[PDB]
Amino acid sequence: TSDYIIEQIQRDQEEARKKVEEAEERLERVKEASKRGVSSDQLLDLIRELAEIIEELIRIIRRSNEAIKELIKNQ
Amino acid sequence: TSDYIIEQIQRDQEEARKKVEEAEERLERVKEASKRGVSSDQLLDLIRELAEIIEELIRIIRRSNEAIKELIKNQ
């Protein structure tokens, strides 16, 4: 509930929304490419890419989790 | 912020982490299944499965984003 902390949290959350929008787009591109008579090797590539997105979104979730904990404790 | 709101936030956050844990587990099994030399239709199935996870993780970020918005407002 201190202003520098609040400032950092708001900055992080803007980064989150931006990252989510890029991820939604990255997802859609993967979906269009995904359903076609395509070669395992490229399907293997798509799986790694989505695995990257998931791990990234989890980092965002954990950082946001920490922010909520910090805000709720400063009651 | 009152206890009812705080409790809703905490309830969502527990549901969130469990889903994150479920995603982490499902991702690795999908990753393990991926490197087991399986067919396209089956690779495609894993991609659909991961796409579900991403969308679920995206909802969590958006709801958590709503929670941080509400908490920062009340002080």
Specify whether the CB–CB gap between A40 and B40 falls below 8 A: yes
Distance of CA B60 to the CA centre of its chain: 6
Interior/surface letters A54-65, b for 16+ CB within 10 angstroms, e for the rest: bebbbebbeebb
Residue with tokens 């929008």: A21
Contact check, Cβ <8 Å, A67/B68: yes
Token pair recorded at residue B18:
């469990």
The whole-angstrom separation of Cα B37 and Cα A52 is: 21
The whole-angstrom separation of Cα A21 and Cα B58 is: 9
Token pair recorded at residue A24:
């939604």
Contact check, Cβ <8 Å, A51/B31: yes
Contacts of A60 in chain B (CB under 8 A): 61
CB atoms within 10 A of CB A53: 23
Probe site for chain A from B34, B50, B56, B74 (most A CB atoms < 10 A):
B50
CB atoms within 10 A of CB B47: 22
Q: Helices in A1-75 by DSSP H: which ranges? A: 3-34, 40-73
Residue B19 has phi, psi (to 5 degrees) of -60, -35
Contacts of B30 in chain A (CB under 8 A): 47, 51
Instruction: Give the contacts of A21 (CB within 8 A, at least 6 positions apart).
Output: none
Q: Collapse the DSSP code of B2 into the 3-class scheme (helix H, G, I; strand E, B; otherwise coil) and give the result.
A: coil
Is the minimum CB–CB distance between B5 and chain A shorter than 8 Å?
A: no
**Reported structure resolution in angstroms:** 2.6
- N-terminal to C-terminal alpha carbon distance within chain B: 8
The whole-angstrom separation of Cα A14 and Cα A52 is: 20
DSSP label of B35: T
Would the CA dihedral through B64, B20, B50, A25 be positive or negative?
positive
B3 CB burial (10 A radius; 0-12, 13-18, 19+): exposed
Specify whether the CB–CB gap between B68 and A64 falls below 8 A: yes
Is the minimum CB–CB distance between A5 and chain B shorter than 8 Å?
A: no
Q: Domains of chain B: which residue ranges?
A: 1-75
